[PDB]
Design a protein around this ligand. Structure first.
Ligand code: CL
Lengths: 239, 239
């Protein structure tokens, strides 16, 4: 049995401001730093250690991973940082306040923009300051890879091949992997591993700062998955 | 003209205790964290940015690099962490107090153990708790690669091939490199780049927390090297 550990980052400064974030590279709040450190200490105490780590190119995830690795005394671990694990891109909604947006355009419209499976937020133009093409960390991306907007469906289209092309082959080689990433790139991955429908994934929100452990059989079929930590605290956070 | 930036980490807790450190994985003090952050801010203000970073597997160097990358807003940068950039291994002296050692064995003997070019500190045995073979981050090393002790000469024997086999080819490919490392692994590299003799390198101490910039010609021969920062502060630190 091979284990995989997933961790969603904690509170960012834009979560405190209630803003759509997407690929905007906002930092963790002090509270989200504390959540990362608590997750790493809990992993140590439950006896987990790793051989390799994946994360995104967004600092709220990278800093989560760095804090977890420090609590494990594994700052030396090999790390790969990939845009393919980035949060869903929120198009022209990036930076707007969610409550103000719901007031101006309607609650139902925001519910569709946030959670309709293949519904896309309104698009950026390439001349917008927020277009990823202007940012040096995406220098190697093609037009087609640079998003103007993403739904969960489009997020799935880029996270699952990376899982299949890169992360899963490394696990098959016997390496113990940790992934530190984001709400919708982890909803994408969990939808796939758990064979969930569109209707099922609609309801799922992964709790922040909570280790999610997958067990895989000899054929790398998932056998079970579970959270580490205080059950009442975690289940509340998942709501 | 291609540029390379070197940075030595700052004060560790064992530097404050005046202890031989070597491969012992001690953390930065608050003062050494501040030095890392100051070096990164200075690099930003002087207009430097990077495409790739190398460091050791020792957290005082890794944490220096992480703080520098945060000040540059390049936490997303690809990082390679290699034991081949580790500090010189201090053998059985690791953990001892330098002043107590000089008292018990003599000042001249400690001067030879610290700085005789090919003089080796007294050796560990493989059963010692400090033997690197017991530590998971060296799992892939051979007996021959696991040190019992190192002189500067032996440090050179492992740092320069890594430069020639790995770092320099990446620079030739047009990538802007930063290296965050240690006193004697950087003395090894500077001896080589500056074509210094044994007598010359004896005197050289690279100041901590100070960007050292190399310029390379079209044939990757070094053309010049210089420090960034306040000259009086740096020259004092170099003493
Ligand atoms: Cl890293």
């Amino acid at each position: 049995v091979t284990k995989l550990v997933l961790v969603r980052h904690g509170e960012s400064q834009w979560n405190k401001e209630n803003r759509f974030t997407g690929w905007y590279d906002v930092d963790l709040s002090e509270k989200g730093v504390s959540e990362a450190k608590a997750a790493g200490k809990l992993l140590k105490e439950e006896g987990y250690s790793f051989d390799f780590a994946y994360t995104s190119v967004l600092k709220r995830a990278i800093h989560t991973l760095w804090n977890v690795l420090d609590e494990l005394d594994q700052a030396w671990l090999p790390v790969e940082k990939s845009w393919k694990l980035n949060e869903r891109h929120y198009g022209a909604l990036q930076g707007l306040n969610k409550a103000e947006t719901a007031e101006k355009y309607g609650d139902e419209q925001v519910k569709q923009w946030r959670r309709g499976f293949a519904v896309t937020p309104p698009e950026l133009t390439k001349d917008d300051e927020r277009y990823p093409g202007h940012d040096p960390r995406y220098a190697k991306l093609s037009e087609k890879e640079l998003p103007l907007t993403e739904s969960l469906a489009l997020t799935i289209d880029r996270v699952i091949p990376y899982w299949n092309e890169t992360i899963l082959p490394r696990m098959k080689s016997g390496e113990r992997v940790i992934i530190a990433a984001h709400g919708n790139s982890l909803r994408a991955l969990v939808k796939y591993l758990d064979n969930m429908s569109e209707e099922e994934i609609l309801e799922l929100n992964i709790p922040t700062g909570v280790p999610l452990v997958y067990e895989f059989d000899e054929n790398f079929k998932p056998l079970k998955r579970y959270y580490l930590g205080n059950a009442d605290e975690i289940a509340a956070k998942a709501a």
